[PDB]
Amino acid sequence: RYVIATSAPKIDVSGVSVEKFTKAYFAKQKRSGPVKKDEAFFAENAPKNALPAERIADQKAVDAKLLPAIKAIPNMKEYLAASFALSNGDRPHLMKF
């Protein structure tokens, strides 16, 4: 409900495995943080939630499997690097996405 589906030509995505992306893959870290009653006071133990390496590796692997598909067809690289924004005279009820 928060995406505009455009009529731009589709990108070849069949070449990247997607079955690993499940509900558990995107879930948030369950509340925990095993702590003892001397460091919770004087609260300097909080680690950071920096994205682990395999998330970066999966992102890079997806980029490798996606870049040739977007490079071959013209204007894809500049289109995706762009941003969508309305201006005066643009009427969304009449513009065909």
Binding site: Y2, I4, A85, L86, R91, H93
Partner: protein, 106 residues
């Protein structure tokens, strides 16, 4: 030119009312470019909001937003009826609202 805008400008016209009785619970909103009840069917269910200033730094900001939703068309000339979580103040007649594009179906 600058862009970064994902909303359609709208005006808070008035409340729903008869000649002498007013209903603050429903508001009349005129959207830019929507001039018929056929085009007003597009904006139904969208989220309309009223954004204003204040003085207290609520979470470190002077901005305040009253959200809402477009409910149905009103009349023939593209006016719509908008329901807001808090009824809009009467002093905001002719003010400028923001009709976001979500939830989207096109």
């Amino acid at each position: 030119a600058q862009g970064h805008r994902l909303y359609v400008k709208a005006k808070h016209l008035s409340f729903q009312r008869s000649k002498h009785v007013i209903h603050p619970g429903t508001s009349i909103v005129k959207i830019e470019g929507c001039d018929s009840k056929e085009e007003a069917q597009f904006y139904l269910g969208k989220r309309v909001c009223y954004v204003y200033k204040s003085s207290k730094a609520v979470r470190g900001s002077k901005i305040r937003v009253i959200w809402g939703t477009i409910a149905r068309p009103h009349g023939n000339s593209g006016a719509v009826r908008a329901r807001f979580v808090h009824n809009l103040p009467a002093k905001t007649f002719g003010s400028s609202l923001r009709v976001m594009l979500y939830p989207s179906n096109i």
